[PDB]
Amino acid sequence: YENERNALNATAANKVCGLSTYLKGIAHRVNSESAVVTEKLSDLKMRSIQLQLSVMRNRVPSGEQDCKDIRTLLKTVLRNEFTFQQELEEMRNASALAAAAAGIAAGRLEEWIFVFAQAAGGSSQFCISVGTNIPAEYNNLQECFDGTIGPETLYKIEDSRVKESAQKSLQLHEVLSSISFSSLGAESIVEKGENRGCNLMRTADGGLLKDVCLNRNFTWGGGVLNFGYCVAGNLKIKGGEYGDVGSHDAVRWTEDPSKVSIFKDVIRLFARFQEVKNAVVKKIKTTVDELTKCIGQKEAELTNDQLYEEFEVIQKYLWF
Amino acid sequence: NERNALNATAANKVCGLSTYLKGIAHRVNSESAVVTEKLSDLKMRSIQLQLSVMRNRVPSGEQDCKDIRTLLKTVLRNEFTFQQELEEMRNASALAAAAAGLAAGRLEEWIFVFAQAAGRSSQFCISVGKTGPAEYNNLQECFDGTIGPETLYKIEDSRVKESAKTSLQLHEVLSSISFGSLGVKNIRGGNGKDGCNLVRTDTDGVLEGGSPTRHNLTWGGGVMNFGSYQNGSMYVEGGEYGDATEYGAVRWTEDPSKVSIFKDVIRLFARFQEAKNAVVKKIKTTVDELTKCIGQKEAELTNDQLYEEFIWETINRLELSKR
Amino acid sequence: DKTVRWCAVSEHEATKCQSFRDHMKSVIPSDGPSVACVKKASYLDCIRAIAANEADAVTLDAGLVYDAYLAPNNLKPVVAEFYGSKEDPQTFYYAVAVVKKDSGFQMNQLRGKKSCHTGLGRSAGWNIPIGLLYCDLPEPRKPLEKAVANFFSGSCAPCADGTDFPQLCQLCPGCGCSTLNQYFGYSGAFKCLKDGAGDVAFVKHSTIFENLANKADRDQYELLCLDNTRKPVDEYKDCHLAQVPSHTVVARSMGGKEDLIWELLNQAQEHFGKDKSKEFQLFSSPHGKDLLFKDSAHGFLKVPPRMDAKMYLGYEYVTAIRNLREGTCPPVKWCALSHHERLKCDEWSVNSVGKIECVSAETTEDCIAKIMNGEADAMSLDGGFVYIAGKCGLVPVLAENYNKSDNCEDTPEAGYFAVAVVKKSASDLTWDNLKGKKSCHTAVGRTAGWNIPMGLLYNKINHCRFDEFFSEGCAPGSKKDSSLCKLCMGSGLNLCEPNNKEGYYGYTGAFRCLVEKGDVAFVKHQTVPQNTGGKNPDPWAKNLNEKDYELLCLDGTRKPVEEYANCHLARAPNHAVVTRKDKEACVHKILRQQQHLFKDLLFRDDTVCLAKLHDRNTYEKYLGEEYVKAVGNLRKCSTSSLLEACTFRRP
Ligand SMILES: *[C@@H]1O[C@H](CO)[C@@H](O[C@@H]2O[C@H](CO)[C@@H](O[C@H]3O[C@H](CO)[C@@H](O)[C@H](O)[C@@H]3O)[C@H](O)[C@H]2NC(C)=O)[C@H](O)[C@H]1NC(C)=O
Ligand SMILES: *[C@@H]1O[C@H](CO)[C@@H](O[C@@H]2O[C@H](CO)[C@@H](O[C@H]3O[C@H](CO)[C@@H](O)[C@H](O)[C@@H]3O)[C@H](O)[C@H]2NC(C)=O)[C@H](O)[C@H]1NC(C)=O
Ligand SMILES: *[C@@H]1O[C@H](CO)[C@@H](O[C@@H]2O[C@H](CO)[C@@H](O)[C@H](O)[C@H]2NC(C)=O)[C@H](O)[C@H]1NC(C)=O
Ligand SMILES: *[C@@H]1O[C@H](CO)[C@@H](O)[C@H](O)[C@H]1NC(C)=O
Ligand SMILES: *[C@@H]1O[C@H](CO)[C@@H](O)[C@H](O)[C@H]1NC(C)=O
Ligand SMILES: *[C@@H]1O[C@H](CO)[C@@H](O)[C@H](O)[C@H]1NC(C)=O
Ligand SMILES: *[C@@H]1O[C@H](CO)[C@@H](O)[C@H](O)[C@H]1NC(C)=O
Ligand SMILES: [Fe+3]
């Protein structure tokens, strides 16, 4: 009853690992989304070479929709060749950071669960349960491990499912909400009313410390699982954060993952990248829209391959 | 039997490594900012050369200035290839960043769990010599203020930003946590009665009324390796993940390059660095060909005056063909 | 320092304490213990002050002693108040369920009966019975009063609101909280039964003797036991609901001045205790009644150190209070001796597919303690440990059979034989000629290895110093600084350890000791044949033959190992599976079920099967009158911290 040491449910463990591999996938996600911008930029370079060929034919549509000033048209064309790469640098700077910050959160969650998964002993005592007198194994912990529980069996950033998790159409906010207290349910987090001898979840004497309660509050994850200074027996889980553990009794699983220490920076820096990504994309859009109204129909219907052959021809002509 | 703890120096060196790995994100960003400086310089030079060609000021070729026709064709195509190589490089920059992040997160969780595992009556998991608990005053490579989740170092924190600025290489920092560099003196600490269960695998340690016999518990990715029946005495020997025995000593990594989490970091940071060096060499060689055939008049021309005089000339040469 | 900060809950208690300090200062030297007093609002603020290292000690009733042991306080019983003579101290009271002779209902049949309680919220009259019957109560069990009212067909629970719960006052309308209510208190609860108003009275063991002076009158009453049987009112020690400590001094589990409080209170009872000084009285004051300590107390006794609040309060009391506090309501955990036994137990856990579970402990008495409190459910024990375990409240359920039988399961055995093994070469050795020689014991407290040869030795030398009698030897469990740990083979810390980590522990281990270091080994009759003649593949045993070993007969005679039948020290009771009384049926069922399906780890390796017990379901009954008497004779020479603790509750 008081000597009672509950274990974490495998389902709760898998959901943490789930988020963990999504976070490992943020690197590939930024790379994919960044790649779209460069495709949109490549189209701008191809369409501006279409304009320069129209400038050279002197067969620039006499669109009263401001194609009369040849000077400022070409000035912005050359300017673009430099203005864009320094704003694209800004978005990649934010991509690296979000990718890393996410990686930190992933590792924090991974260590936690992996240590709990290793704290298993033949029968009766363990930290991740499945209801039986047998601890949870790699088949139960499918989102955590790719086989026999160990350090090389955990998912790496270049691994199989990390890459496919990056194309899951799931947004950060949704995945984060998945591990909230509501989305998990009190019951599905901890295996209550069972003594599985897991000391990693006891702040009271004979838990983390053998003779005393802790001098302070304790947290697994970065505020995912929270404990009071003297938690013993049947784990009284309620929704809340590290700040919400007022009593010695208190066990609190996060209700708002954005309030969790480790997720804060991921949210922030992914938002930075997205903010920039989308501002660059609108810059390209407004520019493409202003150049297109000046490109001549003869050069417009011109295919990418022969567009570059013909450019060289008049280019070398005018130079000499 | 003695009940010892992990010493603050071991915790601090592990923390240090973690803040270096968080620094890798900023390191790749700086290194990539160097490249785009060099690539912009290349794009500058090509306009300058184009202007000299139109103004016929390309010097009496001491080098191959006689065939600017071909040496400009190749440059306008090389400018395009470098942009695709840049993106391959940046792809690697984000993966290196993330992989390093992972490694840092794993270590941070480990040390932070030991740092919090501290109570009254000189009972703790992190020591300051033969006493403790270690507070935020000790463990300054780990924390900002009193031990908590909000006082650990974050990616944009000054400490991580300043660590990114150093001339220290990955291998150097990795070695700083090896059993050789640390030593038994710097790993085991505390009094013989600090009751730290995180460091005991024998009965009533990590598990109550049992031991983790199914798995050989490893903290980090194989930094601190336990077996099934460790006293909690903090008896340490050098070794890797598979090396831990039932009644033997804790195995502290002899070679941190052999550890699971550092495996992808070494690999992906190297992938970036290799790709970076290759692009930088290519930009150098092409710039060096261009800077030869420009001329002092057009060479001095930069930014707004460059475009201004380049457009001035393109409009002039176009009116020449029209007549 | 040597000062004890005492907690006082009132102004009158704080002043009696100033008087306590001042009078102590006047009789104890500078070097010795001293008192200092601290005032707090209630008992809970006192428990809190101790935990917060502000005060050091306070005396509490069992109910608060439970609250004090709970986190974050983690306090413990250090000193106990006793009542009556020094010879028979009355430290605990027994909560009983008194009924009338021939009423024909058991504990499980209490639903629909008429109950008499001392009062609502009282220990013996409410908290203990209603705590135990909690799960027998109808749903919803909250409010508790409503549920109790719907369980019994009419009650008398004084101090309860009859306006809300009228069924609780059916026998004493109004539930009067004064002695004016005829059925109030212990006496009244008994009167409620005596007058035939109720069917059961929840009282103390004493209540019948306090209300009926004639032995013939008391004979017409019986007690309800938890095993669903009845027993006479004079058999309360064998038939009760709970065993409750009267008044207990508490202090911190770690960093608590346990020894300093004992020293101060032992010195205090000697100087100002019962019939000692006219100047100051420890158990009396003009400022009020029961200040700091109960006025009825006769003095203090030290609580055995092995004793923890749970064990001290007892399983029954703890279970009653847990049920009431928690409200939690709807396989066998086998205890293993070190990692060797645990490894085997684990195989058994998975193979049995969630029928048997495991728990580890380094000693057998640590395991007995685990069974006792509830951490574990059952374990197979040697005869000597069945005696200790039984004296701790546990019961045997199955016996280990070793002889080849047709129906082994229902054919009981008289036991194995304890023998003294010598080499054929050491012809100078006689049963009497063992003084100043080297001995090899299985372990201390074991049948063949300790209890039988050391009992026969104590009945001759009439003293407990066995380390003086022998030159050296190996008896795992002995003090590591004794001569009886000098011949052990355990690696550093593992030397003289009572488990398989020590190489000379057990029957095979003691035989190995005789061959390698000693000159006499105390084992079972079948130890020499089981290891000799290549039967043991181990390097030390591989080349040994039983022709080279003899037996020491009690008549100073020597005979071969096969002639054990007429050259044995004594018959030894077979090893038996012990458990908590409240587990007998399930252990018996699963073990029989398991037995038909599936070094001496968990059980002796010469076990052919697990045999049923009938009338012999008590330690006295199983071990037999002869063995119990022989082990009892060695109580003066006991080393067991567990036995010392278990006998503090039931000597
Ligand atoms: C039980 O706790 C013990 C301390 O409380 C711990 O003792 C340690 O035992 C080892 C034995 O290997 C000693 O190390 C010795 O081993 C090397 C081998 O290369 C020898 O050259 C040296 O003599 C060396 O001293 C340790 O010194 C000793 N530790 C201490 C602090 O005294 C046990 O290991 C613990 N048991 C288990 C199973 O963990
Ligand atoms: C940077 O990494 C990006 C992913 O993190 C990557 O984007 C993706 O590029 C691949 C090809 O490299 C595209 O996949 C297509 O091609 C493969 C060829 O085997 C097919 O199997 C697929 O079905 C698919 O047609 C992805 O579509 C593309 N992702 C997105 C969303 O655009 C970049 O290409 C990498 N950039 C560099 C320069 O290395
Ligand atoms: C890209 O990240 C870098 C920092 O890693 C930003 O700053 C450049 O790099 C160092 C940082 O110490 C400075 O000395 C340089 O002067 C910065 N600029 C350049 C062009 O190298 C960089 O500015 C971030 N990206 C953007 C577009 O702001
Ligand atoms: C999660 O928790 C426990 C684990 O033993 C169990 O009830 C189940 O697997 C999960 N919850 C539910 C109600 O399905
Ligand atoms: C968590 O524990 C600390 C240390 O005992 C305590 O002071 C604090 O009040 C608790 N947390 C909160 C935010 O209440
Ligand atoms: C850690 O180890 C070193 C060497 O043993 C020593 O400084 C001390 O014991 C510990 N504490 C600190 C402050 O490093
Ligand atoms: C380490 O783990 C593996 C698990 O199969 C096993 O060799 C053993 O249990 C452990 N210890 C040793 C000595 O390798
Ligand atoms: Fe025996």
Side-chain angles (χ1 to χ4, degrees):
Chain A
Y1 276 89
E2 320 87 9
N3 41 220
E4 201 180 299
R5 284 150 237 239
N6 300 162
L8 215 252
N9 174 345
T11 73
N14 271 301
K15 225 96 164 284
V16 170
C17 289
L19 171 64
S20 186
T21 70
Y22 179 94
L23 287 157
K24 289 164 189 162
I26 274 159
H28 306 284
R29 276 176 181 274
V30 296
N31 278 352
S32 296
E33 286 166 32
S34 264
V36 176
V37 184
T38 55
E39 241 188 314
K40 284 171 154 251
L41 244 170
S42 143
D43 175 71
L44 173 81
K45 265 95 194 216
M46 182 231 279
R47 289 223 175 99
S48 39
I49 264 67
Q50 252 174 23
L51 192 134
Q52 297 185 252
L53 245 127
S54 278
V55 157
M56 288 170 222
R57 296 289 147 88
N58 199 252
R59 248 147 188 259
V60 186
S62 30
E64 320 285 279
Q65 235 206 316
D66 226 70
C67 291
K68 218 203 112 280
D69 196 6
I70 324 151
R71 194 165 286 279
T72 52
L73 261 171
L74 288 145
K75 212 136 287 181
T76 47
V77 152
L78 280 171
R79 198 175 283 121
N80 290 339
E81 203 65 65
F82 296 91
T83 62
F84 276 119
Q85 58 195 358
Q86 294 295 316
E87 211 200 357
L88 212 80
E89 202 210 69
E90 186 174 53
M91 96 138 81
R92 285 323 267 275
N93 284 14
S95 82
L97 291 168
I104 307 155
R108 278 269 236 127
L109 299 172
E110 185 156 80
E111 185 76 328
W112 165 30
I113 302 305
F114 172 59
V115 163
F116 272 46
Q118 289 197 117
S123 78
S124 329
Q125 21 275 139
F126 43 88
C127 287
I128 305 175
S129 189
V130 283
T132 59
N133 71 340
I134 308 301
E137 225 63 39
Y138 67 92
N139 51 297
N140 306 321
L141 276 4
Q142 213 117 97
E143 258 162 298
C144 301
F145 313 94
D146 188 34
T148 318
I149 299 169
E152 239 60 46
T153 202
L154 285 158
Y155 301 103
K156 292 156 225 79
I157 96 117
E158 273 210 304
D159 255 60
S160 63
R161 78 168 54 208
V162 167
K163 291 173 130 66
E164 46 207 61
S165 162
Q167 43 206 39
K168 262 202 146 220
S169 88
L170 251 168
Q171 284 196 297
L172 229 197
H173 77 279
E174 304 173 317
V175 194
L176 280 174
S177 300
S178 86
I179 62 99
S180 79
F181 185 73
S182 304
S183 315
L184 245 38
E187 307 311 320
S188 110
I189 295 142
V190 154
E191 179 189 46
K192 278 158 284 298
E194 238 79 30
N195 194 325
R196 264 71 224 271
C198 179
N199 273 340
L200 304 172
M201 272 197 276
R202 173 192 270 251
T203 53
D205 60 282
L208 302 156
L209 261 26
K210 101 140 198 176
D211 295 298
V212 81
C213 310
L214 303 187
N215 238 335
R216 40 180 58 77
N217 253 294
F218 189 90
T219 178
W220 285 104
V224 188
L225 224 193
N226 301 286
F227 297 95
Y229 74 87
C230 206
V231 172
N234 214 310
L235 257 63
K236 10 242 276 222
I237 355 283
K238 289 199 206 131
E241 319 302 317
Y242 190 82
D244 295 306
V245 180
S247 81
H248 63 280
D249 255 25
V251 182
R252 240 120 280 216
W253 187 279
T254 186
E255 261 295 20
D256 186 350
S258 79
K259 289 188 175 98
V260 172
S261 73
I262 55 153
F263 306 138
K264 286 158 153 210
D265 258 11
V266 193
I267 299 154
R268 186 169 77 60
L269 292 146
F270 193 68
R272 206 88 302 123
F273 162 82
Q274 223 75 30
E275 158 179 53
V276 184
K277 196 249 273 174
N278 295 348
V280 169
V281 163
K282 87 185 278 185
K283 228 129 280 172
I284 294 164
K285 205 222 163 188
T286 69
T287 303
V288 168
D289 294 0
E290 256 64 76
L291 296 183
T292 51
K293 50 171 161 77
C294 294
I295 309 153
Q297 244 280 274
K298 192 194 187 284
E299 294 75 44
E301 67 201 66
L302 238 284
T303 314
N304 178 270
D305 317 293
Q306 50 249 246
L307 205 123
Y308 297 144
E309 293 186 293
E310 279 200 71
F311 184 80
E312 291 177 305
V313 169
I314 333 156
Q315 196 182 40
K316 293 160 219 167
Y317 172 89
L318 278 140
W319 280 342
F320 358 102
Chain B
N1 79 266
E2 277 196 342
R3 294 298 249 94
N4 299 118
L6 182 84
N7 197 45
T9 173
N12 273 307
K13 260 166 142 209
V14 171
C15 278
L17 170 61
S18 184
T19 129
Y20 179 100
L21 293 154
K22 291 170 196 173
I24 284 168
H26 295 274
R27 284 176 179 268
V28 298
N29 274 348
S30 287
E31 281 165 55
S32 299
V34 144
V35 181
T36 67
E37 268 176 53
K38 301 260 260 97
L39 189 59
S40 253
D41 187 75
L42 184 256
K43 292 178 167 188
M44 236 255 308
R45 256 69 192 259
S46 71
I47 300 157
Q48 300 184 316
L49 172 71
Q50 280 191 61
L51 237 186
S52 319
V53 160
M54 289 165 94
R55 292 179 168 178
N56 292 294
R57 296 207 181 119
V58 169
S60 182
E62 293 88 21
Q63 192 124 351
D64 292 294
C65 287
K66 84 150 248 80
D67 218 318
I68 30 86
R69 200 187 284 270
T70 57
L71 300 155
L72 249 158
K73 267 194 244 180
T74 43
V75 152
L76 291 155
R77 280 177 166 140
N78 285 12
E79 215 169 302
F80 175 76
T81 320
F82 302 155
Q83 216 82 40
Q84 260 106 267
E85 272 171 47
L86 256 249
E87 272 121 44
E88 287 157 66
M89 183 229 281
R90 270 295 198 169
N91 264 42
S93 94
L95 304 171
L102 230 187
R106 292 276 248 105
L107 301 168
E108 183 149 78
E109 193 61 12
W110 164 30
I111 304 302
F112 177 52
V113 156
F114 279 58
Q116 288 177 109
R120 289 185 151 205
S121 294
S122 259
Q123 226 82 342
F124 46 85
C125 285
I126 305 176
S127 66
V128 189
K130 55 119 72 200
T131 38
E135 293 302 347
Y136 90 98
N137 14 298
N138 321 286
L139 319 171
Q140 245 172 264
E141 291 188 53
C142 302
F143 304 92
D144 235 336
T146 47
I147 293 158
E150 298 302 337
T151 56
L152 264 330
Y153 293 100
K154 289 134 182 194
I155 200 140
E156 265 176 344
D157 286 1
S158 349
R159 205 149 200 285
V160 175
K161 287 222 223 80
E162 74 188 35
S163 104
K165 288 171 171 196
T166 90
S167 56
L168 280 213
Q169 304 165 71
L170 229 183
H171 68 96
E172 295 179 70
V173 187
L174 281 181
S175 298
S176 81
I177 72 141
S178 72
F179 184 71
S181 307
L182 274 180
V184 213
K185 278 190 180 87
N186 289 322
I187 298 166
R188 169 184 64 251
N191 41 79
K193 42 225 97 191
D194 56 54
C196 175
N197 282 333
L198 291 184
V199 116
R200 172 170 172 92
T201 49
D202 212 320
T203 142
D204 308 322
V206 138
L207 284 172
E208 200 70 5
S211 305
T213 62
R214 284 194 179 238
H215 307 290
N216 337 46
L217 208 303
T218 181
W219 297 89
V223 183
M224 201 188 201
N225 305 289
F226 282 88
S228 48
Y229 315 117
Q230 274 65 41
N231 251 340
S233 56
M234 267 302 291
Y235 168 36
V236 218
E237 274 178 359
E240 299 305 323
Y241 176 56
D243 296 0
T245 81
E246 286 181 319
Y247 303 97
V250 186
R251 300 314 197 91
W252 197 283
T253 183
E254 286 277 32
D255 195 346
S257 69
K258 292 173 176 123
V259 174
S260 77
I261 46 176
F262 311 132
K263 277 207 183 80
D264 299 73
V265 185
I266 288 154
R267 194 229 303 139
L268 293 156
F269 195 52
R271 173 196 279 201
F272 165 74
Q273 286 266 215
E274 278 162 11
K276 202 253 286 190
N277 295 329
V279 174
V280 175
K281 285 156 203 173
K282 286 169 85 153
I283 280 161
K284 186 63 177 148
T285 68
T286 40
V287 157
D288 296 339
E289 259 78 276
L290 296 188
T291 56
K292 283 173 187 107
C293 314
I294 285 163
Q296 273 147 332
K297 278 160 177 181
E298 336 278 286
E300 197 76 75
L301 252 99
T302 186
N303 319 121
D304 29 67
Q305 347 133 50
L306 179 65
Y307 321 125
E308 144 265 295
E309 261 170 67
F310 182 73
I311 296 322
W312 247 41
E313 190 67 58
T314 313
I315 255 109
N316 269 307
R317 277 269 199 175
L318 264 152
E319 243 47 65
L320 205 137
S321 67
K322 282 180 245 292
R323 275 201 154 185
Chain C
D1 69 320
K2 276 218 205 155
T3 192
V4 178
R5 298 160 294 176
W6 206 275
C7 208
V9 303
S10 72
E11 188 56 29
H12 324 285
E13 234 171 49
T15 38
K16 188 197 183 171
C17 192
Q18 261 301 143
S19 185
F20 178 39
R21 173 203 294 162
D22 296 333
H23 281 95
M24 282 284 106
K25 240 109 249 288
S26 310
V27 291
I28 287 114
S30 61
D31 61 280
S34 163
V35 233
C37 231
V38 185
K39 196 187 160 175
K40 284 285 132 102
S42 63
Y43 289 113
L44 252 136
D45 278 87
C46 270
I47 291 154
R48 245 107 68 156
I50 304 172
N53 214 107
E54 290 169 50
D56 294 303
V58 69
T59 333
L60 300 162
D61 303 284
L64 279 151
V65 160
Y66 180 87
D67 300 4
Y69 109 87
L70 298 179
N73 315 305
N74 297 308
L75 309 185
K76 61 155 179 183
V78 293
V79 190
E81 274 181 40
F82 74 88
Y83 309 89
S85 75
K86 299 159 135 195
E87 301 88 81
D88 182 15
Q90 299 173 72
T91 313
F92 297 84
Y93 66 93
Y94 289 82
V96 300
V98 194
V99 287
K100 296 225 235 208
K101 200 179 203 76
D102 316 314
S103 48
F105 66 87
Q106 300 304 335
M107 192 76 60
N108 51 11
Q109 282 183 79
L110 280 163
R111 195 208 155 261
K113 306 293 163 295
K114 288 172 171 72
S115 56
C116 313
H117 309 278
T118 66
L120 176 80
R122 267 86 197 164
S123 197
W126 186 263
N127 302 307
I128 292 151
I130 305 307
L132 301 171
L133 304 165
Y134 191 77
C135 281
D136 293 45
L137 300 172
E139 260 289 297
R141 294 177 244 257
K142 258 81 222 222
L144 188 71
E145 287 102 297
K146 244 181 185 79
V148 178
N150 305 329
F151 178 73
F152 297 116
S153 70
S155 303
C156 177
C159 322
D161 202 46
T163 309
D164 293 328
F165 321 101
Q167 264 187 276
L168 280 180
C169 307
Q170 212 211 271
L171 314 180
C172 54
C175 285
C177 204
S178 77
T179 71
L180 229 129
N181 166 8
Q182 48 159 25
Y183 297 161
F184 176 87
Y186 294 104
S187 29
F190 187 78
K191 202 191 176 285
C192 169
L193 174 69
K194 178 187 169 274
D195 293 31
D199 305 291
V200 69
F202 299 108
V203 289
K204 266 172 68 228
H205 62 313
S206 59
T207 311
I208 194 151
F209 309 111
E210 293 166 350
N211 286 256
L212 298 175
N214 302 330
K215 203 247 133 72
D217 292 334
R218 293 183 245 127
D219 271 348
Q220 312 321 116
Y221 294 90
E222 284 178 298
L223 307 171
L224 296 175
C225 330
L226 301 178
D227 68 334
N228 306 306
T229 64
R230 295 179 176 214
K231 270 174 195 65
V233 303
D234 66 277
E235 268 199 78
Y236 56 90
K237 283 168 189 174
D238 302 277
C239 182
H240 57 272
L241 305 213
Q243 199 183 325
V244 197
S246 303
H247 217 208
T248 328
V249 187
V250 300
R252 308 171 213 95
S253 290
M254 167 112 304
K257 292 121 105 159
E258 313 142 34
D259 303 315
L260 182 64
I261 301 154
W262 168 247
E263 190 183 44
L264 175 96
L265 294 179
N266 196 11
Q267 285 300 292
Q269 68 170 348
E270 221 65 39
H271 286 61
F272 302 99
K274 212 93 186 289
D275 300 67
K276 298 276 190 173
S277 192
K278 219 104 254 92
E279 295 269 305
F280 177 78
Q281 306 86 45
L282 224 74
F283 311 114
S284 10
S285 201
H287 304 98
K289 189 197 94 287
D290 295 337
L291 298 166
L292 302 171
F293 313 95
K294 263 149 176 60
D295 298 327
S296 49
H298 279 216
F300 314 114
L301 289 165
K302 222 263 213 296
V303 178
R306 157 70 92 147
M307 194 104 66
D308 70 305
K310 275 198 273 80
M311 199 202 284
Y312 186 73
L313 289 163
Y315 180 64
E316 291 82 16
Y317 183 85
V318 154
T319 306
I321 267 67
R322 272 156 172 181
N323 290 350
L324 290 178
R325 302 257 195 280
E326 274 71 68
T328 301
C329 194
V332 173
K333 9 195 171 72
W334 202 266
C335 212
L337 227 219
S338 194
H339 316 131
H340 299 249
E341 273 206 12
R342 181 58 195 243
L343 230 292
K344 177 175 184 162
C345 188
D346 283 347
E347 275 287 321
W348 186 21
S349 198
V350 64
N351 278 356
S352 66
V353 63
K355 287 275 173 171
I356 309 291
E357 283 161 331
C358 307
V359 206
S360 304
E362 239 58 39
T363 77
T364 294
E365 58 173 39
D366 278 330
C367 254
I368 290 160
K370 281 196 150 126
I371 315 295
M372 273 175 80
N373 82 267
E375 279 176 79
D377 282 336
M379 114 208 90
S380 177
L381 293 176
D382 169 270
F385 292 98
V386 172
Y387 178 85
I388 313 148
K391 279 215 152 273
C392 288
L394 312 174
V395 296
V397 288
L398 289 175
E400 272 180 19
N401 269 10
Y402 319 111
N403 212 24
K404 181 197 176 194
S405 179
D406 308 353
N407 203 284
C408 166
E409 265 236 290
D410 216 6
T411 313
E413 291 173 16
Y416 55 104
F417 296 105
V419 297
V421 184
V422 284
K423 299 128 268 75
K424 205 185 189 191
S425 51
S427 58
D428 65 85
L429 299 174
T430 285
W431 164 244
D432 318 292
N433 198 68
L434 294 191
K435 4 90 177 174
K437 285 271 174 161
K438 291 158 161 70
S439 63
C440 297
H441 311 264
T442 60
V444 357
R446 286 256 225 137
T447 324
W450 194 266
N451 299 3
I452 281 163
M454 301 298 103
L456 293 170
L457 177 64
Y458 180 70
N459 284 310
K460 286 265 84 59
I461 60 166
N462 232 300
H463 76 87
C464 306
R465 300 145 31 238
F466 314 122
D467 69 301
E468 250 77 61
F469 184 87
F470 294 126
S471 54
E472 54 191 332
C474 185
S478 265
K479 278 221 191 293
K480 297 172 181 288
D481 74 321
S482 178
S483 71
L484 290 188
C485 288
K486 286 190 191 283
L487 288 190
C488 296
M489 69 165 263
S491 310
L493 324 108
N494 301 154
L495 189 98
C496 220
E497 219 50 52
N499 58 63
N500 299 281
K501 283 169 170 177
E502 166 54 65
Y504 293 152
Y505 170 85
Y507 301 120
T508 314
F511 184 53
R512 195 194 175 160
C513 177
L514 173 79
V515 171
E516 302 180 346
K517 295 189 185 77
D519 47 57
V520 68
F522 304 103
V523 287
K524 56 179 185 196
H525 75 266
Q526 62 266 70
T527 298
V528 187
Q530 248 123 75
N531 297 285
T532 57
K535 299 292 110 204
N536 188 356
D538 265 68
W540 67 268
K542 223 260 180 183
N543 345 91
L544 304 175
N545 48 299
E546 51 200 89
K547 294 176 209 172
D548 305 323
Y549 307 101
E550 300 241 282
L551 297 177
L552 299 173
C553 318
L554 292 152
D555 56 305
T557 311
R558 304 227 322 188
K559 281 201 160 199
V561 184
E562 218 78 7
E563 283 177 61
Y564 59 87
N566 22 266
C567 188
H568 61 257
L569 297 168
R571 183 146 226 150
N574 302 268
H575 293 197
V577 172
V578 320
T579 191
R580 268 146 11 86
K581 217 278 175 209
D582 36 82
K583 265 271 172 287
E584 284 186 285
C586 235
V587 178
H588 211 282
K589 170 110 186 164
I590 311 154
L591 279 184
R592 272 174 55 87
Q593 168 223 56
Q594 257 301 125
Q595 181 209 356
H596 298 325
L597 313 175
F598 299 92
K599 241 290 191 289
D600 309 304
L601 300 176
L602 297 186
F603 303 94
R604 254 165 63 151
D605 294 334
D606 56 351
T607 303
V608 291
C609 100
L610 281 85
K612 306 155 98 165
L613 306 174
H614 303 110
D615 279 37
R616 317 181 295 153
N617 64 297
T618 324
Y619 79 90
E620 312 115 21
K621 291 172 169 183
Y622 181 82
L623 300 178
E625 295 176 290
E626 187 55 82
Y627 190 57
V628 183
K629 269 255 192 182
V631 192
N633 179 71
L634 283 140
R635 182 77 188 89
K636 305 111 224 72
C637 321
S638 183
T639 42
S640 189
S641 57
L642 177 94
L643 185 64
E644 174 210 44
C646 294
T647 56
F648 183 89
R649 302 191 82 248
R650 196 210 236 263

